[PDB]
Structures are given as C-alpha cells and as structure tokens.
Amino acid sequence: MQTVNEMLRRAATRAPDHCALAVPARGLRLTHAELRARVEAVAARLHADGLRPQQRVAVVAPNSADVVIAILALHRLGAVPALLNPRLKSAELAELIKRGEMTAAVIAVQVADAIFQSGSGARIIFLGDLVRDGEPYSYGPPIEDPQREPAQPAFIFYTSGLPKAAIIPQRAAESRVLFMSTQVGLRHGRHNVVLGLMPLYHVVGFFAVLVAALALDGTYVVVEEFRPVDALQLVQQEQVTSLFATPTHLDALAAAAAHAGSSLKLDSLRHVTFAGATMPDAVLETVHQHLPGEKVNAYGTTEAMNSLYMRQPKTGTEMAPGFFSEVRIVRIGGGVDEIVANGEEGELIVAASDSAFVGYLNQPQATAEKLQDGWYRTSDVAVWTPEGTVRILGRVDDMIISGGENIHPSEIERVLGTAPGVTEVVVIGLADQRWGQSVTACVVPRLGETLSADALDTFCRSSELADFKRPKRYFILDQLPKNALNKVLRRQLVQQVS
Amino acid sequence: MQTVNEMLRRAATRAPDHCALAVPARGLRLTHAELRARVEAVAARLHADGLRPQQRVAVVAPNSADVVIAILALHRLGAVPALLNPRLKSAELAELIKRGEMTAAVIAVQVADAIFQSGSGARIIFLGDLVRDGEPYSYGPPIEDPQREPAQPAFIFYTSGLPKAAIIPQRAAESRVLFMSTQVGLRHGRHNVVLGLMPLYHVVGFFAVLVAALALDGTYVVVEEFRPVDALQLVQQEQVTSLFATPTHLDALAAAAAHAGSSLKLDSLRHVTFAGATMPDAVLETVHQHLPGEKVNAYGTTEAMNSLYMRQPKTGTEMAPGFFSEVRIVRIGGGVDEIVANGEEGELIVAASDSAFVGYLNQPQATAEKLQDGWYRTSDVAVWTPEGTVRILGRVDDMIISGGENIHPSEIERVLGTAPGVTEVVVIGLADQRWGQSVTACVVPRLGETLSADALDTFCRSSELADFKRPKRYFILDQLPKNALNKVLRRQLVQQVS
Ligand SMILES: O=C(O)c1cccc(Cl)c1
Ligand SMILES: O=C(O)c1cccc(Cl)c1
C-alpha cells in the first residue's frame, strides 16, 4: 500500500522546493519541503503532550493552511483524524466527539464550552496554539514514523439520525486519490494547480482535492471562503488547472463567468469536476456554455469514494463505473445477488474493495446494513439505461410509492423548480390514499410572490411528467425545515404538514 | 491490493461487450466478456490436468492472442507464469526452466527437444493444444479463484551470466499499470486503443501495455511481427490512442511516417512512450518532427518498473521521478545513505516499495546485491543536473575509469556512431595504461567501406568530446559478438581484442 503520509512524503522528495500550499489572500506560500517541516514539528509537539498512534482526534475548523498542517500532522504522528463539519450544532459536535471516544479535539470555532460540558473528557486544543498562519509553535524531540497496516484506521469522515462516523482504513487512500487521475485525467507533475473549493471534512475535499494536489507534486490553493468572482480571479491569477466543486458553486461560477466574458482569463482550467446527480439540467447547460475545461460528472460516497462518472455529460444523472469500481443494481431490500432486469429499478450497490470504509464507529448494526457480502449498499435508486449507463433516480429513503408505483421526488422537484414564482420545492409522500402514499409538493414562493395549487397543477399538467407523478396536493410555505447544514429534513417536514 | 486478475475481472464487468483483443491480420476480435470466458476455460482445463496455485509455469512464445489467453489463464488458476524470450538459445531456455524448478512449460517454438533432455521434468505443453486462434479446447469442472496475498509471487520476468528470474509479487501489478496513467496520461475508458508493439516477456509489454490496455476497459491490438509501414496502417485503421515502443521501433516508424506524410492518418495517436535513455539525439529529433502525440520518455527496470520520466523530452538521458517513485544518487559501491554532492556522479537507487520485485528466484546473493535497506540498486550511473533532473550516464559495469576518470562508453559511442562510414561501434576499457583502463573503440564499417584509426581520431578530435574521453585505440571489425538477443557482449569482446 501507499498511505497518505507516504504519498506526501514521496512527493516532498521529488519536489521539495515546489509550492505546496498557496493562500493568495494571506500572502502565504509554502513549498513541499516547508510543508513537511511544519507537519513534522506539529506532530512532534502533539506527541510531546501525550498523543499516541490510533487515538482518535476530532478536527473542527473551516478550510485553511493551518488546519491542513494540523490534519497532516495528526496522521504523521499516527493519530486518527476525525474531521467534522464546523456548521454543526455545538450540541451535535459535542455529542459526536462523545460517542467517538475521541482523545482530543482540535477546534477553531463557545463550541469549546459545549465539549467540556458534554462529559467527554476530550482535551480541547485551539488550532491557533498549534500553528498560526503556517508557522507552528515547536517543542519536543523529533518523532518516529509509526507502523501502518492496510486495514488499520486512518481517518474518520461523517455522513448525511446523527451523522455516522465512517472509518477510512490506511489502504483506501491511494485509490481515493488516483481516481482523480484514472477518471478525471489528472496526471503527475508540477503544472498541477488545484483550487481548494471543497471543504476538508468531505472525503472529496480531503483525498480527491487536498491529497491529490500534493501527491501529484502540485499546489493546493487554499480558499477560506467561496466568492464566485474572487474564485475566478484565483483561476486566472494562480493558473488553476483543476477544480472540483459542488453544483451550487458551479451555478455561481458559470453565471459570474457569463457576466465576465473575456474579462477573466480562465484558459488554464482544464478540469471542472462535480458530483452532479442532483444538478438540474439548466445549471449543467450553463456549465458547458460558460466555463472552460473538460467537464466530468462523478458519483461517489463517503463510504466507498468514486463509483461512477461521465466525461462531457448531457444529463447529470447518467454515469458509468470507472477504474477500481464494480457495480450492480439489485432488487430494493434484497440480497446482493438479486440483479434486476435491465430496465427495472433497484438499489445501487458497489463492491467494497480497497477504497471502502471498514465500518461505522460504534454502530455495528448500521454497518451490517451497509456492508453485505463484500458489497457496499448506497441506498440510492438506479436503473440501467438501454445504452449501458447508470441513471441515478434518488435516495431509497425519499422514494414515494403511490398506487404501487415508484415515484422519485427529485424528478418532480426539478420540474416544479422551473415553475415561475417558485424559490424552493420539496416533494414528499404523505401516509395516505390513492394508496400507500400521496405525492405532495411543498413550495416556497419567491420574495413578494403568491403561488396557488391550481396554477402549479396547471404547470405540472403542461410538463413532461406522467399522470401518477403529478402532485395530488400542494402546501405553500414560507420556508422548509433544514437541519444544521442546508439540506431538507423530509421526515420532519412530513411531520409538520400532517 | 488490486491484482492482475482483479483488474481484468472488474474491467470485464464494466465493459463486457467492448473489444478487448484485436488481431487485424487474423480477422480476430474478442470482447472483454469473451476474453474472460476463454481465460476461465483454459484455466479449468489446465487445472483438470493437475496444475496447482504457486506452481511455476514457463511461457515461451512470440506475441499473439493465444499466448495472452494462456498467460492470463495460468494467473487466473493461480500458477505463476515465468515469461521467457523466444529468441533465447534452446540450451539457455532449458537451463533457465531447470533452475526455476518450473512445473510445466507452455511453448510455441526443437526447443521442446532440449527441455526433455535437460533433466528438468517440466511437462511440455504446446500452445496450440490449449488455445488456437482464440478458441480453446475445453474440459473439466469450473474452478475456484485462489486466495492471493500482497507479497505472494505472481509473475516471473527475466533480466539483461544467464538471465536472472525476477519475482513480481501480487501487489506490484497496480502501480506497474497505473504509472501509464500518472506519468503518461492514459485514463480509464473505451476510447483506449493500445498497439501491442512490445514483447509480452518484457514487463512493459505485459503490465504497461497488455494489462493497462484491458484494465482501462480498452483494446489491445496484437502485433505478431513488427513492420514499420504496416504498424502505421494499424494506427490509422484501429484508431490507436497510444503506443509504447523501443527506440529501434520509433526510428523505423518516424522514417516510414516521413516517407508517408499525410498518406497515413495518424491523428488518433496521442501517446508515444519509450525507454529512451540509450536513444541518440538524432532519432529523438525525428520522433518529434515526424510522429504525432505527446512524446514521453520513461526510465525503468524489470525489478522496480517506472522510476523516472519526461514529457516532451529534449535529450533522451534527462528525466525526473514520477508518482510511486523515490530516488537517490549515491557513491558507487557505498551505502544507500551516501548521497553524492549535486554534480558528482553515482549509482541510481530507487526505493523498493509496492512495485518492487521481491528477489531473484534461487539467487539470494544477487538479491542481496540489488535490494539493500529498502532500496533497489539499478547499477546505472547518474548525475543530478543543476535543473533538478536525473541524467542517466550508462551502466556501472560498462563504466571505464581511465587515469582515475569516469568515462562512459555510451557517450563515445553516440559521437562515433555519427562518423561517416560507421555502422556499429562499442567502446570498452582495456586493462592497461595511461592507467587502469584504456579507452578503446571497436567499429564496424558500412558495407563496402573502409575505416581508419587516423580518420576516426580526426573525427573525434573535431567533436564535442573532452580530451581524456577520446579513444586511444581503434579496432575495425567485421562484426561485434552479440549473445542470443541483439546486445553486445562487452566482456567477451574485450576478451576477443586482448
Ligand atoms: O459525496 C460525494 O458526492 C462523493 C464522495 C466521494 C467521491 C465522490 Cl466522486 C463523490
Ligand atoms: O526495461 C525498461 O526500460 C523499463 C522497464 C520497466 C518500466 C519502464 Cl518505464 C522501462
């Protein structure tokens, strides 16, 4: 195997004086060799204070050079970084750190208050006391490089109840990085300038962006806060070769580029990658018109990383397996060998090989639901297209079954989202009749505007949707309940309207 | 890990009906699924005759669809293919199979005579009795897929005394394939059409060409015999995306393309890769002028695969480490930690990690010479250029040390090779004076032509060579002694002229 530490160490010997970390705002550049020296020093200093290999340390911070040093430092020591979204509720973060029996918590968020008062006896480390603007506080004797095993825990990442802690083994690093090369077409070399738009607590942000950038002897451009015109200036200024970004980032970037034209020089950007299963046709449309570089749509999971992709995509929902990947579509709630007839819908399962998580920390029942007979079960519904591609339909959990028929809310949402006057829409099934579930649309109007059930129904009737998929009922709401992050709490919403 | 078998198996599930093997001459195409079925059937039939996992089977055959099936078949069974050059002497092949305690010998070469009469009780299998033109003789019950371990032997390849048997472990396959992607820029997908110019008994021919082609869900184009104009027609006809070829192939191909112009459509060819350390500046020159695609120079060994490379190269001798690679230049005949001053010459050693051989079969002394303290020693002399690239000078064994000075015969040979009237030249050191060794040139004239020591000396004097490097003596010969393959036996030649 080749671990994160080894990938980064080998890179440092090949390109010691090439720029590793760029923070254009803070006037901060760090070479590969200089990044190593700080990783070594924070490692040693963390060790000199009683942190041992395999001890889980929480990390809760926005993107920055300092948090990159600290995360790599912990891994170099041998500790297992558990990376957590800083948008989470103080209460949630304290609770997650408690369940995880975490030894320490590196924070740069008040949230420190919550952790002491949770019971969890996790040592609160403030990030600014380890490393500040790339320069660390040093002390302690230089430290040994611990022995690392293929199945051994290496990093913990969190999912979608409370977020679950997915354990990423040492051997998963390489293929979690190299798919950026086999699928996306990144290659080794110092031309690589990678814009860090993705948060570091998401596996793409860490393995596919941060680690890939350095492991290929390139440069990682730190972005502490996303602004669409500023990001495009970075593309031009830094000579960005690739960016991996959310559908929401790309909508912003494409529109800013459209209201920029040849004001910004974007030619250096050769790779625009995104997880676009949920990307509407209209955003995809603008991405091709207004942004340069080859576009690659990618499907993946925290649990197994990349499982499908598409070069120069037409719809955002249709993709095919790449290198490392093996996939099947099986009967919903059946065994891993129950393959559907091409054309019938089912659950996407992918083989659980090198890139796979090895279980959810302290949640062995959820693990047993997800890892069966060598497969990882996505909980996503899919269908083989006659053209040999996989069409992602939606989450199994969001699926509505009305009059014995599979209806996917995401399909209805993308239609209703184009209805004039609509700012947000979530489609849900209410426990009911026609039977089983009744398709119901919850719609938020644009600021100042009225909506009516009649007008929306007329709009749906005049759209491509088939009979049974048309909502039977509409609720016009001033907002939708959306947890600590900005994703809808369907269950909670269903509970609100009934 | 991801083994050859697993790489090819996963590929078959992703692209069952895409063309895997093309033999345009024989009118033979085989899809991925069809190639699998034959690999399964020859495997089973080989098993039904008493071949067990980990038993070494020799393979001695020119390139063909049938030998690809048989090699993959043996690996699928679990047997360890030992691939041998068919150009070797009958006596040599019998002897190598004897030392290797090989259980069987798959041959398609008389050479069968030699093997029985060597003592080695290796079962002689004729290739035409396993599979002919892609259709096998089937029998026996379908067979289990054996458990494979990371350090376990998988394939045996032979080197430069008698050729040594380098044992390639299961875990070496992935990085021996994926460097074609990280260094060379191959990516996953069915556009991949790979021309099989390289012999299958060379690690590049097997891992970097055959296995890479299939593992990326592409097509391998079988070439049973190299002809420069025919090969270029294949590029055009088959839509070849990449070729990996020897310097000798590229000289032929470039000249045929120059005496073709826009007669042949070569635009589909995006990657032209070669091991060009020994490629003269003039051939490289023509490669850029007359052949399309990005040119990539690559340095590597049987023992550790790829260790250096260069995109769009200027000299053929200057390269830098890519992904997976770590390299040092150390004092000749010193410890792995004795790094030279940048500018001093030394031995190129590369780290022995995932891609590395695990030893020479039954030759533990040679192993101990080559694998020290986690490094592989190339036996190649190199120097760091002020620009941070590695300049390969020549083999340590060919090095001449005259008047206490490092002189590399390859440098002198490339100068003398341009002297009009010269068809071949080898430079050697004779045990002698000035002192230690005396630089001596052995030159073969062109058909019908005379050479003189005086005229050659005049030519050298008028060349870029420094004082001490000029040959002190010339031998004009009608030929140079060149073993079973076409490489010069320096030791033997030295012995001839003295
Ligand atoms: O969260 C995702 O969409 C994701 C996660 C891992 C890998 C990929 Cl390609 C995508
Ligand atoms: O024999 C060579 O030159 C060789 C062997 C393995 C890998 C490479 Cl890139 C080159």
Picking from B185, B215, B326, the nearest residue to A10 by CB comes out as B326
Residue with tokens 């030394």: B346
Q: How far is the CA of B177 from the centre of ligand 2 (A)?
A: 12
Q: How far is the CA of B203 from the centre of ligand 2 (A)?
A: 7
H-helix or E-strand containing B156?
strand B153-158
Q: Is the CB of B300 under 6 A from ligand 2?
A: yes
Q: Which CATH number fits domain A1-169: 3.10.105.10, 2.40.100.10, 3.40.50.980, 3.40.50.10490?
A: 3.40.50.980
Measure the N-to-C terminal CA separation of chain B; round to a whole number of Å.
Answer: 53
SS3 B298: strand
Q: Which CATH number fits domain A397-498: 3.65.10.10, 3.30.300.30, 3.40.50.300, 2.60.40.10?
A: 3.30.300.30
- Alpha-carbon separation of residue B268 from B24, B166, B234, B241 (angstroms): 17, 36, 11, 6
Q: What is the DSSP letter of A339?
A: B
Those residues whose C-beta lies under 8 Å from the C-beta of residue B22, and which sit 6 or more positions away, are B28, B29, B30, B219, B220, B221, B222, B238
Residue ID of nearest Cα to ligand 1 atom 4? A300
Residue type, B383: V
What is the b/e burial string over B144-165, where b = at least 16 CB atoms within 10 angstroms of the residue's CB? eeeebeeebbbbbbbbeeebbb
Whole-number Å distance between alpha carbons of B408 and A194: 42
Chain B residue numbers touching A183 (CB-CB < 8 A) = 187-188
Whole-number Å distance between alpha carbons of A336 and A338: 6
Residue with tokens 């959820």: A366
Picking from B150, B182, B353, the nearest residue to A181 by CB comes out as B182
Q: Is the CB of A350 under 6 A from ligand 1?
A: no
Chain A residue numbers touching B148 (CB-CB < 8 A) = none
The closest of B175, B143, B137 to B324, measured between CA atoms, is: B175
Whole-number Å distance between alpha carbons of A274 and A356: 20
Q: Is the CB of A298 under 6 A from ligand 1?
A: yes
The answer to whether A170 and A3 have CB atoms below 8 angstroms apart is: yes
- Alpha-carbon separation of residue B369 from B301, B363, B490 (angstroms): 15, 10, 21
The answer to whether A343 and A383 have CB atoms below 8 angstroms apart is: yes
The answer to whether A347 and A381 have CB atoms below 8 angstroms apart is: yes
Cross-chain Cβ contact B182/A185 below 8 Å: no
Method: X-ray
Chain B residue numbers touching A305 (CB-CB < 8 A) = none
CA B443-B446-B447 angle, 5° bins: 130
Q: How far is the CA of B245 from the centre of ligand 2 (A)?
A: 11
Residue ID of nearest Cα to ligand 2 atom 1? B301
Whole-number Å distance between alpha carbons of B203 and B154: 13
B271: its two tokens: 């990657």
Those residues whose C-beta lies under 8 Å from the C-beta of residue A387, and which sit 6 or more positions away, are none
Whole-number Å distance between alpha carbons of A108 and A131: 11
Whole-number Å distance between alpha carbons of B139 and A225: 65
The answer to whether B183 and B306 have CB atoms below 8 angstroms apart is: yes
Do A170-316 and A397-498 have matching folds? no
Whole-number Å distance between alpha carbons of B382 and B389: 10
Residue ID of nearest Cα to ligand 2 atom 10? B300
A42: its two tokens: 């924070």
What is the b/e burial string over B85-106, where b = at least 16 CB atoms within 10 angstroms of the residue's CB? bbebebebbbbbbeebebbbbb
Fold assignment, B317-396: Luciferase; domain 3 (2.30.38)
Whole-number Å distance between alpha carbons of A79 and B149: 27
Tell me the structure's resolution in angstroms, rounded to a single decimal. Answer: 2.5
Cross-chain Cβ contact B324/A2 below 8 Å: yes
Residue type, A122: A
Cross-chain Cβ contact A188/B323 below 8 Å: yes
Query: Could you state, in order of their start, the residue ranges of all structural domains in chain B?
Result: 1-169, 170-316, 317-396, 397-498
Whole-number Å distance between alpha carbons of A373 and A379: 16
CA distance B173 to chain A (A): 12
Those residues whose C-beta lies under 8 Å from the C-beta of residue B439, and which sit 6 or more positions away, are B400, B402, B407, B412, B427, B429, B468, B469, B470, B471, B472, B473
Q: How far is the CA of B294 from the centre of ligand 2 (A)?
A: 18
User: Testing the interface with A: which of B182, B184, B217 to mutate, by most A Cβ within 10 A?
Assistant: B182
Cross-chain Cβ contact A354/B2 below 8 Å: yes
A151: its two tokens: 């199945």
The closest of A161, A167, A188 to A177, measured between CA atoms, is: A188
Q: What residue of B is the nearest CA neighbor of A10?
A: B326
How many CB atoms lie under 10 A from the CB of residue B336? 16
The answer to whether A316 and A278 have CB atoms below 8 angstroms apart is: yes
What is the per-residue DSSP string for A379-422? EEEEEE-TTS-EEEEEETTT-EEETTEEE-HHHHHHHHTTSTTE
Residues, chain B, total? 498
Cross-chain Cβ contact B320/A354 below 8 Å: no
The answer to whether A96 and A163 have CB atoms below 8 angstroms apart is: yes
Cross-chain Cβ contact B10/A324 below 8 Å: yes
Beta A56-60 vs A104-107: how paired, if at all?
parallel
Q: Is the CB of A172 under 6 A from ligand 1?
A: no
Chain A residue numbers touching B354 (CB-CB < 8 A) = 1-2
Cross-chain Cβ contact B14/A326 below 8 Å: yes
Fold assignment, A170-316: Rossmann fold (3.40.50)
Picking from B175, B187, B353, the nearest residue to A185 by CB comes out as B187
Backbone φ, ψ for residue A154 (5° rounding): -130, -45
Whole-number Å distance between alpha carbons of B430 and B447: 27
Q: How far is the CA of B106 from the centre of ligand 2 (A)?
A: 25
The answer to whether B207 and B324 have CB atoms below 8 angstroms apart is: no
CA A460-A254-B187 angle, 5° bins: 100
